Design a protein around this ligand. Structure first.
Ligand SMILES: *[C@@H]1O[C@H](CO)[C@@H](O[C@@H]2O[C@H](CO)[C@@H](O)[C@H](O)[C@H]2NC(C)=O)[C@H](O)[C@H]1NC(C)=O
Ligand SMILES: *[C@@H]1O[C@H](CO)[C@@H](O[C@@H]2O[C@H](CO)[C@@H](O)[C@H](O)[C@H]2NC(C)=O)[C@H](O)[C@H]1NC(C)=O
Ligand SMILES: *[C@@H]1O[C@H](CO)[C@@H](O[C@@H]2O[C@H](CO)[C@@H](O)[C@H](O)[C@H]2NC(C)=O)[C@H](O)[C@H]1NC(C)=O
Ligand SMILES: *[C@@H]1O[C@H](CO)[C@@H](O[C@@H]2O[C@H](CO)[C@@H](O)[C@H](O)[C@H]2NC(C)=O)[C@H](O)[C@H]1NC(C)=O
Ligand SMILES: *[C@@H]1O[C@H](CO)[C@@H](O)[C@H](O)[C@H]1NC(C)=O
Ligand SMILES: *[C@@H]1O[C@H](CO)[C@@H](O)[C@H](O)[C@H]1NC(C)=O
Ligand SMILES: *[C@@H]1O[C@H](CO)[C@@H](O)[C@H](O)[C@H]1NC(C)=O
Ligand SMILES: *[C@@H]1O[C@H](CO)[C@@H](O)[C@H](O)[C@H]1NC(C)=O
Ligand SMILES: *[C@@H]1O[C@H](CO)[C@@H](O)[C@H](O)[C@H]1NC(C)=O
Ligand SMILES: *[C@@H]1O[C@H](CO)[C@@H](O)[C@H](O)[C@H]1NC(C)=O
Ligand SMILES: *[C@@H]1O[C@H](CO)[C@@H](O)[C@H](O)[C@H]1NC(C)=O
Ligand SMILES: *[C@@H]1O[C@H](CO)[C@@H](O)[C@H](O)[C@H]1NC(C)=O
Ligand SMILES: *[C@@H]1O[C@H](CO)[C@@H](O)[C@H](O)[C@H]1NC(C)=O
Ligand SMILES: *[C@@H]1O[C@H](CO)[C@@H](O)[C@H](O)[C@H]1NC(C)=O
Ligand SMILES: *[C@@H]1O[C@H](CO)[C@@H](O)[C@H](O)[C@H]1NC(C)=O
Ligand SMILES: *[C@@H]1O[C@H](CO)[C@@H](O)[C@H](O)[C@H]1NC(C)=O
Ligand SMILES: *[C@@H]1O[C@H](CO)[C@@H](O)[C@H](O)[C@H]1NC(C)=O
Ligand SMILES: *[C@@H]1O[C@H](CO)[C@@H](O)[C@H](O)[C@H]1NC(C)=O
Ligand SMILES: *[C@@H]1O[C@H](CO)[C@@H](O)[C@H](O)[C@H]1NC(C)=O
Ligand SMILES: *[C@@H]1O[C@H](CO)[C@@H](O)[C@H](O)[C@H]1NC(C)=O
Lengths: 595, 136, 595, 136
C-alpha cells in the first residue's frame, strides 16, 4: 500500500501520492476510496472491476483527460461519484454505462459546454446533479429529463447563462408533477423573455448575485409573472459587484408571483421600507439573514406572516410588532446590545432570543408578550435577566432555557411558581448562590435540571428537591460543593443520571442514594473522595456506571472492606485499570487483605 | 395582639418584640390582600431616635423556611421623598404613606416577619415588631 | 446610679427611668448626659451647679412645665441644649442666663407662640436655632438679632406662617452682611405682599410642601422678584397634599430672581418641558432628586449650567446632551436599566454613572464622550461593561472604578494601555479570569490596585506586576489562589500593604517578600498555612503586622525553627494569644524545643 | 519567505507551516498599517476541503507572551455572506474581500500568529500559515 489506510480493511484514503493508475494491492470489500490529486491522466477499462462493494468514489484534481468505454464496468453499488477539477471536455456517448445506482453525480469545473452533450439519459436513479462552474450558455433543459424520475435538484451556478426563453422550462410545462429545485446564482442574467415563467412550479429558486442595475433587476423581476415558487431566495454577496441603490420599487413585479417562503440574504444598501411593501402581504414565512436593518418600526396588520426570523442582522432597538397571525418569532445572534420591550402577539407559540445581549430588565409577565400559547422560551447566552414575576400568564411553557445569562433575584422568592407543566429547565452557568429552599417549588412535572456553575450556601447541598418527583436527569457538576446534607434525594425515585464531577467533596457516603431505585449512572470523578463510609450494601441494584477517576482514593488499609469492594464489583466501575492510590506506596490497584 | 385585620384572602396580625417594647401605632387601609393591593399605611409614634438615617432589617420565614435577611433603606438624609425623615427624638410623627403591589404569586401557608427599625447613624434599634400573615 | 453608664466616668446615659430630679450621685467631670423621657416636671435652681464640665445636655419628653430663675446656673461649657417635647409655653425673662457658650438651641414642639417672646438676646454665640412645630404665626424677625452675630441658620418649618410682609425681612435690609439661611417648609403660605423681597440676600431658602394651587403658587412665586438666593430648593413630599398639575407657566416669576443653585426635589406630576424653560439659563448648578422624569431630550445651547445631578430619578433612555459649559455630570442610582449612548461635552471633567444598570457595550473611546479633560470616571455597580478600546483619547484620567460591573474582554488584549497617569484602579468583584501577563501594562503611575473576586489560571499567581513600580497598596483577598509563582514582587519596592486573606494557600515561603523593602503589613489570615519554608531571616526589617489567624499552622515539631520563631518574634504578630495548633495535641501555643 | 509587504509603520511577512504545506496565495491592498486600515485582501487557492464549515485557530504571541487561543468562524453553512463558502475540494477559489479596522492602540515590538484553517465538519486542517508582524 503506497497509500494511507484509515480504518482496518475499509476507507483507504490514498490522496496525494504520485500515482498513475489505481493500486492493485487495494483489498476488495472496501466501501470508500479517495484518489485525489493523484496524477492520473486516463481512465482505463475494467480498472475497478474487482471493487464490487464500493459506494463512495472520489476522483478530484486528477488530470483525467479521456475515459475508456468500459471504465466504470464492475461498479454496482457506487452511490456517489465526484469528478471535480478533471478537464474532461467531451463526454462521448457510452460513458456512465455500468453505474446502476448512482445517486449523486458531481461534475463541477470539468470544462463542460452544454447539458445536451451529456450522456446521462440512462441514470434512472440520479437524485442530485451539480454542473456548476462549467461554461454553460443556456438554461435549456433537455428532453431526456423525462426518464430521470427521481431528480430533485439541479445546480447551474457560476456559469455563462445570459438569457431565458419560453422554449426553455418547456419540460416543466408538460410535466406538472416534477419536484425540481433550480439554482442559478452568479449568472449574468440581463434579459428574461416575456411570458417565460407561465404555469411553472418550482420548489426553490436562488438568484443571489445576478444583477447589478436597479433598472435591469426591476425589469427582469417584473418578467417573473406567473411563477409559483415555494422558496424564493434573494440577496447579494459581500465579495462581489452589487447594487448600490436598493428601493421598494425593485420589488415591483413580485406582486403577482406566488411566493410561499421569501428569504432575503445580505444586501449592501438596505432601507427599512423594503419589508413594508404592499405585495409581501401573502408571504407565509418571512426571513432575513445578514441584512443591515436598523428599525422594524410598524408593519401593516393585514400581513399574513406565520413566521419571522432575523438572524445575524444589526438592530438598534427591539422591534415593535403587532401581527395577529405571526407565530414562531426568532431573533438570534443580533449584532448589537438591545433591551427587551413589550410586544403584542396573540398567536405566538415559539420564541427564541438567544445569543443576543438582550438585557431583559422586567421579567416573566403576560403583559410582556401578549400570548397565552407560548411553548418554547429561550433566553440563553444573553446579558442580564432580572426576575420580578412568577410567569403569571405563561402557564403553558414546556421548555425554558437560561444558559449564560446573569439571572438575578431568582433566590429572593419562589420563582417558577406558576409553571405547573414544564419539562426542561436549564439554569447552568448563571451565577446563582442557592440560599433558599423553595426556589424549585411548583415544578411538579420537571424532567431535566441543568445547573453547573452555581454555588450554594455553606458549600452544602441543601434540601431543594422536594415536590420534584418526576425528575429523571439531574446535573450538579462544577459546583464547588464540600458536603451533602442529610435527607436529600429521599424522593427522587425516578432519577436515572446523577452528575457530580469536578466538585470538592472529601469522602463519600452510602446513606444517600439508598432511595434512588432506578438510578443508572453516578458519575463522581475529579471530586477528591478518599473512602465510602456507611454500609456499602445499600447502593441500588441497578447502577451500571461508576466514575471513580482522578480521585485520591487512599489504599493504606484505610477501610479494607472498601478497598476490596472497589476491585471486586469492578464490572461496573469505569476504567478500573488505572486506579492509582495516593498514600505511599502509590502506583497500585489491589490491597493484600482479601475477604 | 397589638393589631390585626382580616382581608378576603389574608389575615394580618402584629405584636411587639420581646427585647424592645417601644410604643408605635401602625395600620393600613384597606386590609392588604396578598392578591395585589393599592392603598395607604398610617403611622403614629414618637421617634426614639433621629429618623434621618432610618432603615429596616426583615427576618422572614415562609412555612418555617428562613429566607435570607433583607435590608430596606427608607431615609438616607439627602433630600428624601418623605416628610417624616426630618423628625427628631421627642417630636410626634403622624403620617400616611401610599403603596401598591400586584403581579407576584404567594404560596398558601403561614409567614412570619421580624421587622426591626434601625437609626443608621448610631445603630440603635428604634423598635421591633413581630408580624404574622396567614394566606388561605 | 439608678441609670446606665456607657463609658467609664463619662457619657452617663440615664434615659427612661422613673426620675423626678437630677441624680446627685452622677460623678462630676462628665461630658454627656441624657435625661430623656424621665418624668421631671420642673427645673430647680442650681441643679446643675456641680457639672461644670458638661458640653452636651439633652432633656427630651420630660414633662418640664416651668423653669426656675437660676436653673442653668453653673453651666459654662454647655454647647448643645435640646428641649424637644417639653410643654414650656411661656419663656419668662431671665431664662438661659448662665449659658455663655451655647451654640445650638433646639426648641422643637415647646408650644412656643412668637419669636419676640423668646429671651435669647444675650446668647451671643448661638450658631443654630430650631423652632419648628411651634404655633408661630409670623415670619417677623425681631430686632435683637442684631446682637447675635454668629447666627447662620433658622428653622421655622411646620408652623402656622400664613403671609409675608415688607416690614418683615427688614433686619435683612438694614444688614447686608448677615449670612442667614432660612427654612419655611410645610407652612401654608398663600399671600406674599408685593415688593416683599427687595435688596435681600439669603444663603438658602427651602419651600417644600407649601402650596397646593398652581394659581397660588404661580402668584406667590411671581412676587419673589428681587430676591438673590444662593440655593433655592423646591418640590413636594410624598405623604402630603400636593399639586396635581405642574406646568412651566408656574416657573414664571422666577425669571427675575438671581438663583445660583436650583434644586428640584420630588414632584407628583412632572412634564419634561419644565427643565426646558427659558429663564433657567443663568442657573449655575442644576440638580434633580427624585423627579419622575422620562426623557431629557434637548436643552438649548445658551444655558450656562456648570453642573448637573440626576439622582434617584426614573429614566427610559440615556439623555442627549450638548451643553458646552457643563462640567461634572452625575447620573446615579437611576431607577431603570439603560444603555450608554454617545454624548458631546467639551468641558466635562467629572463623570459618575454608578449604581445604575448602565450596560455600556462599546467602551473607552474619545468618540464616546467628547472631552479631553476627564479626570474621574466611575462605572461601579453597573451591568456589563465591554472593553473594546484602550481609552485612546482619555489620557488624563486619574481615577477609575469598576466594582461590581461584569467586565468583559479585559484579558484578550492590553487594555488600560494609554492611561499613562492613573493613580487609583479598582476592578474588584468583576469576574476576571486573569490569564494574560500584559493586562496591567502601561499603568506606570498606579498607586492602588483592588482585586478581590478575581481568579487566575492554574490558581497560580502569574507575573502580572512588571512595570508597575510605584504601586503602594495592593489587594488580593478572596481570590482562590493555591500557590505563588516564583519571581513575583521582585520590583514592588514601595509596596506598603499586601493583602492575601481568605485564599486557599497551603504553605508559605520567604524567598518571596525579600525585595519588599518598605512593606509594613502582610495580612495572610484564613489561608490555611502550615509552615514557612526557606530561610526565615529574609523577611524585611520593616514589617509591623502579621495576621496568622484561623490557619492550621501545625506544631507537631514540624519545622521546630518556625515553631520557635512564631512565639519569639510575636511583638509583631496579631493576637498571638489564641494561636491554636491543628495536629494532636491541639489547644497549645509553645513547642518544647527552645533554640 | 512566501510573501511580505512594508507599510509606513508595519512589516508583515508570512511563510508556510511545518507540518502542513498546502499551497495558498494571499495578499492585501494596501499594505496594512497597524494605525488603522481600509482595503481588500486577495485569495487564490484550491480547497483541500469543502469550505462549507470553515473556521480558524489563531495562536498569537505579543513579544513572547502567549495570548489565549482565538477561534473565528468565517462560514457556517446557513446563508453565509461570502461566495466562496460554496466551493468544493478541487474547485479553484479566486476572490477579494474588503475590511476596515481603526481605534485600537497596539504596542511596539514583535508579534507572531500561527493561523490554521479547519473544515469544521470533518475537522481536518486545510492549511497552516506562519505570520510575522513587526511594529515600529
Ligand atoms: C422536493 O425536493 C426537495 C429537495 O430535497 C425536498 O426537500 C426536503 O424535504 C425534507 C422534509 O421536508 C427536508 O427535511 C429537507 O431539508 C428538504 N430539502 C431541501 C433542502 O429542500 C422536498 O420535500 C420535495 N418536495 C416534496 C413535495 O416532497
Ligand atoms: C453661610 O452659612 C452657611 C451655613 O453653614 C455656610 O455653609 C457651609 O459651608 C461649608 C463650606 O462651604 C460647607 O461645607 C457646609 O456644607 C455649608 N453648610 C451648608 C449646609 O450650607 C456658608 O459657608 C456661609 N457663608 C459664607 C460666605 O461663609
Ligand atoms: C483584606 O481584605 C479583607 C476582606 O475580607 C479584610 O477583611 C476585613 O477584616 C476585618 C478585620 O480587620 C473584618 O472585621 C471584616 O469582616 C473583614 N471583611 C469581611 C468582608 O469580612 C482585611 O482587613 C483586609 N486586610 C487589610 C490588611 O486591610
Ligand atoms: C489583620 O490585622 C491587621 C493589622 O492589625 C488588620 O489591619 C487593619 O484592618 C482595618 C480594617 O480593615 C484597617 O482599617 C486598618 O488600617 C488595618 N491596619 C493596618 C495598618 O493594617 C487586618 O484587618 C486584620 N485582618 C483580618 C482579616 O483579621
Ligand atoms: C481486512 O483484510 C486483511 C487483509 O486481507 C485481513 O487480514 C483482515 O482480517 C480483514 N479484516 C479486518 C477487519 O482487518
Ligand atoms: C482482481 O484480483 C485478482 C486476484 O487478486 C488479480 O489477479 C486481478 O488483477 C484483479 N483485477 C485487476 C483489474 O487488476
Ligand atoms: C429513455 O431511455 C430509453 C432507453 O431505454 C430511450 O429509448 C428513451 O428515448 C429515453 N427517453 C427520452 C425522453 O429520450
Ligand atoms: C454590471 O457589471 C458588469 C461587470 O463589470 C458590467 O460589464 C456591466 O456594464 C454592469 N451593468 C451595467 C448596466 O453597466
Ligand atoms: C395577495 O396580496 C395582494 C396584495 O399584495 C392582495 O390584493 C391579494 O388579495 C392577495 N391574495 C390572496 C389574499 O389570495
Ligand atoms: C411541597 O413540599 C412540602 C414539604 O416541604 C409539602 O408539605 C407540600 O405538601 C408539598 N406541596 C405539594 C406536593 O404540592
Ligand atoms: C415573634 O413571636 C413568636 C411567637 O408568635 C416568637 O416565637 C418569636 O420568638 C418572636 N420573635 C422575636 C424576635 O422575639
Ligand atoms: C394624625 O393626623 C390625621 C390626619 O392625617 C388626623 O386625622 C389624626 O387625628 C392625627 N392623630 C391624632 C392622634 O390626632
Ligand atoms: C471615674 O470616677 C470613678 C469614681 O469616682 C473613679 O473610680 C475612676 O477612676 C474615674 N475614672 C475612670 C476612667 O473611671
Ligand atoms: C455637689 O457635690 C457636693 C459634694 O459631693 C454635694 O454635697 C452637693 O449636694 C452637690 N451639689 C448639688 C447641687 O447637689
Ligand atoms: C444687645 O444686648 C444688650 C445687652 O448688653 C442690650 O443693651 C441691647 O439693646 C441688645 N441689642 C438690641 C438690638 O436689642
Ligand atoms: C389647599 O389645601 C388646604 C388644606 O386642605 C385647603 O383647605 C385649601 O382649600 C386648598 N387650596 C385651595 C385653593 O382649595
Ligand atoms: C439671565 O437669563 C435671561 C434669560 O432667561 C437673559 O435675558 C439674561 O441676560 C441673563 N442674565 C445675565 C446673562 O446676566
Ligand atoms: C515592561 O516590562 C518589560 C519586561 O517584561 C520590559 O522589557 C519593558 O522595557 C518594560 N517597559 C517599560 C518599562 O516601559
Ligand atoms: C513559525 O515559524 C517560527 C520561526 O519563524 C518557528 O519557530 C515556529 O515553530 C513556527 N510555527 C509552527 C507552528 O511551526
Ligand atoms: C482572479 O480574479 C481576478 C479578478 O478579480 C483576476 O484579475 C485574476 O487574473 C484571477 N486570477 C487568475 C490566476 O487569473
Amino acid at each position: 500500500n503506497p497509500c494511507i489506510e484509515v480504518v482496518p480493511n475499509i476507507t483507504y484514503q490514498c490522496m496525494d501520492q504520485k500515482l498513475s493508475k489505481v493500486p492493485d494491492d487495494i483489498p476488495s470489500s472496501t466501501k470508500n476510496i479517495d484518489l485525489s490529486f493523484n496524477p492520473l491522466k486516463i481512465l482505463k477499462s475494467y480498472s475497478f472491476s474487482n471493487f464490487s462493494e464500493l459506494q463512495w468514489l472520489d476522483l478530484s484534481r486528477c488530470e483525467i483527460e479521456t475515459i475508456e468505454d468500459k471504465a466504470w464496468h464492475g461498479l454496482h453499488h457506487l452511490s456517489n461519484l465526484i469528478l471535480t477539477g478533471n478537464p474532461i471536455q467531451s463526454f462521448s456517448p457510452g460513458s456512465f454505462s455500468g453505474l446502476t445506482s448512482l445517486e449523486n453525480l458531481v461534475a463541477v469545473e470539468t470544462k463542460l459546454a452544454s447539458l445536451e452533450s451529456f450522456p446521462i439519459g440512462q441514470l434512472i436513479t440520479l437524485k442530485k446533479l451539480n454542473v456548476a462552474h462549467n461554461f454553460i450558455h443556456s438554461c435549456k433543459l433537455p428532453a431526456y429529463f423525462s426518464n430521470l424520475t427521481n431528480l430533485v435538484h439541479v445546480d447551474l451556478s457560476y456559469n455563462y447563462i445570459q438569457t431565458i426563453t419560453v422554449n426553455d422550462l418547456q419540460f416543466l410545462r408538460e410535466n406538472p408533477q416534477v419536484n425540481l429545485s433550480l439554482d442559478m446564482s452568479l449568472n449574468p442574467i440581463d434579459f428574461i423573455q416575456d411570458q417565460a415563467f407561465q404555469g411553472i412550479k418550482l420548489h426553490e429558486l436562488t438568484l443571489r448575485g445576478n444583477f447589478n442595475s436597479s433598472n435591469i433587476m426591476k425589469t427582469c423581476l417584473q418578467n417573473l409573472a406567473g411563477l409559483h415558487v415555494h422558496r424564493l431566495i434573494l440577496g447579494e454577496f459581500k465579495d462581489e459587484r452589487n447594487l448600490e441603490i436598493f428601493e421598494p420599487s425593485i420589488m415591483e413585479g413580485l406582486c403577482d408571483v406566488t411566493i410561499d417562503e421569501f428569504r432575503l440574504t445580505y444586501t449592501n444598501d438596505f432601507s427599512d421600507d423594503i419589508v413594508k411593501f404592499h405585495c409581501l402581504a401573502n408571504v407565509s414565512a418571512m426571513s432575513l439573514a445578514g441584512v443591515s436593518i436598523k428599525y422594524l418600526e410598524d408593519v401593516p396588520k393585514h400581513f399574513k406572516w406565520q413566521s419571522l426570523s432575523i438572524i445575524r442582522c444589526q438592530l438598534k432597538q427591539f422591534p415593535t410588532l403587532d401581527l395577529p397571525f405571526l407565530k414562531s418569532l426568532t431573533l438570534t445572534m443580533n449584532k448589537g446590545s438591545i433591551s427587551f420591550k413589550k410586544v403584542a402577539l396573540p398567536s405566538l407559540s415559539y420564541l427564541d432570543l438567544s445569543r443576543n445581549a438582550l438585557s431583559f430588565s422586567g421579567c416573566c409577565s403576560y403583559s410582556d408578550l401578549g400570548t397565552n400559547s407560548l411553548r418554547h422560551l429561550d433566553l440563553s447566552f444573553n446579558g442580564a435577566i432580572i426576575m420580578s414575576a412568577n410567569f403569571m400568564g405563561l402557564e403553558e411553557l414546556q421548555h425554558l432555557d437560561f444558559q449564560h445569562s446573569t439571572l438575578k433575584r431568582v433566590t429572593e422568592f419562589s420563582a417558577f411558581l406558576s409553571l405547573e407543566k414544564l419539562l426542561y429547565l436549564d439554569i447552568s452557568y448563571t451565577n446563582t448562590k442557592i440560599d433558599f429552599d423553595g426556589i424549585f417549588l411548583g415544578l411538579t412535572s420537571l424532567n431535566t435540571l441543568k445547573m453547573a456553575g452555581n454555588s450554594f450556601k455553606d458549600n452544602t447541598l441543601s434540601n431543594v428537591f422536594a415536590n420534584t418527583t418526576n425528575l429523571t436527569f439531574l446535573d450538579l457538576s462544577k459546583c464547588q460543593l464540600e458536603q451533602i446534607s442529610w435527607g436529600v434525594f429521599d424522593t427522587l425515585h425516578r432519577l436515572q443520571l446523577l452528575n457530580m464531577s469536578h466538585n470538592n467533596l472529601l469522602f463519600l457516603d452510602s446513606s444517600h442514594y439508598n432511595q434512588l431505585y432506578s438510578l443508572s449512572t453516578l458519575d463522581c470523578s475529579f471530586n477528591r473522595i478518599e473512602t465510602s463510609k456507611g454500609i456499602l450494601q445499600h447502593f441500588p441494584k441497578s447502577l451500571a456506571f461508576f466514575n471513580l477517576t482522578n480521585n485520591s482514593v487512599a489504599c493504606i488499609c484505610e477501610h479494607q472492606k472498601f478497598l476490596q469492594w472497589v476491585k471486586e464489583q469492578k464490572q461496573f466501575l469505569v476504567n478500573v485499570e488505572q486506579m492509582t492510590c495516593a498514600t505511599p506506596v502509590e502506583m497500585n490497584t489491589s490491597l493484600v487483605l482479601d475477604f | 395582639q397589638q393589631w390585626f385585620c382580616n382581608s378576603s384572602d389574608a389575615i394580618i396580625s402584629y405584636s411587639y418584640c420581646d427585647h424592645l417594647k417601644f410604643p408605635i401605632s401602625i395600620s393600613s387601609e384597606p386590609c392588604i390582600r396578598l392578591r395585589g393591593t393599592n392603598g395607604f399605611v398610617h403611622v403614629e409614634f414618637i421617634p426614639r431616635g433621629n429618623l434621618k438615617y432610618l432603615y429596616f432589617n426583615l427576618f422572614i420565614s415562609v412555612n418555617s423556611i428562613e429566607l435570607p435577611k433583607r435590608k430596606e433603606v427608607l431615609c438616607h438624609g439627602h433630600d428624601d421623598d418623605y416628610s417624616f425623615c426630618r423628625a427628631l427624638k421627642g417630636e410626634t410623627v403622624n403620617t400616611s404613606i401610599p403603596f401598591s403591589f400586584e403581579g407576584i404569586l404567594f404560596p398558601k401557608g403561614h409567614y412570619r416577619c421580624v421587622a426591626e427599625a434601625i437609626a443608621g447613624d448610631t445603630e440603635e434599634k428604634l423598635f421591633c415588631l413581630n408580624f404574622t400573615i396567614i394566606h388561605r
